[PDB]
């Protein structure tokens, strides 16, 4: 149930911030699916079932955020203005990226569908695949991911700033410090794509290849940033 | 989090019939962290601030260990500067207390001196082997240090076996935080003459006899 | 004097509390002893000397005592017999004779600290 | 209130996983009804009231799932990663099948409407009733039902795997084991239709008749599978 055996969970009691937060997460994953049109015929029914792969990817992504949220509020049981503020920023980012994720997930499902050879349907429905549009694709979703992890870092830092008020022990202080580092490290990968895309060194698709390729090397690039700080 | 925001907080608290910070000004061990926060130029800065607190009637002139302790435990002052040993008396009182990092001065941290409580055997004692037995097999044991600690806390014990228990205490964490920001005292024979020089210097400047510049002059000699 | 031999890892204090109720209802003393190596001290002492009145050990050691002639044949009435599980009586049987009273089934398990190890091997 | 008198309910306190879950179930049944258009005229009003039979069937179906969920989280009070994962898979399946159920319920209500003689409205609105489409109908809803019961079996097995951590007694162990069997047995009936439909032995509607006929013989076929394992 819990992550650490040395951590004393201050947020075992459910609060308004957590209840409100659960409503928003439930609404996000629910409306992602149920924002679709109701099938009126067999043809619509089969079309609607092609959407489950894109939705599974979206849902998996949203619960992962929900989990991090659950663990934070479980650890510290925080309920102050600044926690409320940072919490709102988080849910706000989530909400604005629900329908854009539905889009990205459908787009990438078609691209990966073409590769593997499952389907051969058109991508002209999405509009013109131009350099500017493919760059904005990275910058958009990259800015989204960066923000979510950035906010998680700020939230843990707020708990670190209130370590004494929360009566955090040496183990708990260590966890909190490690959780900040983790979220900043997670944050850097989208920050690095975003910056590369915005400068655009090549002036062509090469830029987008590199930017996209940093996510495939998430684990190794995270280890490099972590290793650089430890080596000094 | 900073020393420089205490005067503002004190103005706020004095309106509600309460002090902000009360601590032992007589003993230099308590005033040294503020004095040594920056550093000389650092000692001049740190002490002038301490002098300005008494000059602005924020702190009392003859604030000692007893009236500071009592005031905090009674619920008259919002803050105090003390060691592990002082916690048990707070627990006795009905005061929801916290132990934390010492305030920063001029951005940099206040460097408190670090002491190692130590037991020595008197050279002119016939019970040298009996004392060694007591110290080793009875005191410096898990059971032995526990007994002392439940009376008045020892702080971060020297026993290796006590690491888990120390690490579970939030007040110990705050103690270790300040200990890292401070430094261990040299054991040298000149420490006595040093401490006396600082004890007088702080009292003279606090009461209003010698100037801050003239205090460091007499103390360096 | 009623003397009982049971291992020191068992509940001899509790066995004594039963023995204390026995003395109240009869007048016989019930002392409970726990000597080291009683499984191999019983067949030596009980053969020659007096030893205990009643011996407590896992059923596996009792066949050797039975063959040697160190144990009396148990004759419990149907009503007492019926109070215990029939499979338990089988363990305390050597050559069609009941050689002891079954108390409890014992098996080793993995005892683990949930704090140090929540999902053990 | 409780199913078993020998069961010690570990989940009497409400948690985030349960709160989140309640939001999703409420949203599913709510949006099923309220996804319809708002009547603007008397004609729309009467049309909208024809939808209550299909909705009653859908709602009845969803609360039955909600009940099983309520009982599981009541029994074990689980809150770990794997429980979260399996729980998400469940809610995901639910969500993707909300609008398809609305469809099936409306379709079958017209078919049963025609039989009994209450109404005589067209089924051409649903598209062509072809062998391929009627086969996909079984495979779709059959795959949905199979998954829900499959997930409930996995959830109970996760609790069984943590029997010692949960301090489950002999009665509780027995219940858990029985709950796994129940859900696998429930799971098999849709698994058997689905397989029969996918192979398609007859190459015509006969396939669909048999596949559909297994649900009418749910109770007896469940007893056969249960009897086979006990007889050995
Ligand atoms: C890997 C294999 C899977 C590839 C799946 C690709 C899905 O691609 C996506 O399909 C759905 C099919 O409903 C289309 O979606 C369309 O139908 C749904 C049906 O409810 C409507 O809600 C929506 O208005 C319409 O856009 C998307 O516009 C298309 O981008
Ligand atoms: C057994 C007797 C009952 C038979 C009921 C059959 C209902 O059949 C169903 O009716 C509703 C009538 O609103 C139709 O629904 C139609 O009207 C509703 C009215 O809000 C709109 O939301 C929807 O866009 C439209 O599809 C379905 O398309 C039809 O399939
Ligand atoms: O005040 C100067 C004085 O400070 C230190 O003594 C501390 C002692 O270490 C603590 O345990 C505590 O009890 O308070 C004392 C000060 O009040 C130095 O150790 C000592 O030499 C010096 O005189
Ligand atoms: K809508």
Residue numbers in the entry:
A (entry chain B), D (entry chain B): 9 to 240
B (entry chain A): 244 to 282, 302 to 483
C (entry chain A): 123 to 243
Article passage:
Following this line of thoughts, we reasoned that K+ ions could interact with the side chain of Thr38 in a conductive conformation of MtTMEM175 and mutated Thr38 to alanine. When analyzed in whole cell patch clamp recordings in HEK293 cells the T38A mutant of MtTMEM175 showed a strongly impaired selectivity for K+ ions, as exchanging K+ in the bath solution for Na+ caused only a minor shift of the reversal potential by –15 ± 2 mV (n = 4), corresponding to a PK/PNa < 2. For comparison, the WT protein responds to a replacement of K+ for Na+ with a shift of –37 ± 6 mV (n = 22). We thus conclude that Thr38 plays a pivotal role for K+ selectivity and conductance in MtTMEM175, reflected also in its high degree of conservation. We found no obvious differences in a crystal structure of this mutant in the closed conformation. Overall, a significant contribution to K+ selectivity by the extracellular ion binding site is contradicted by the results for the T38A mutant protein - whether the residual selectivity is arising from this motif remains open.
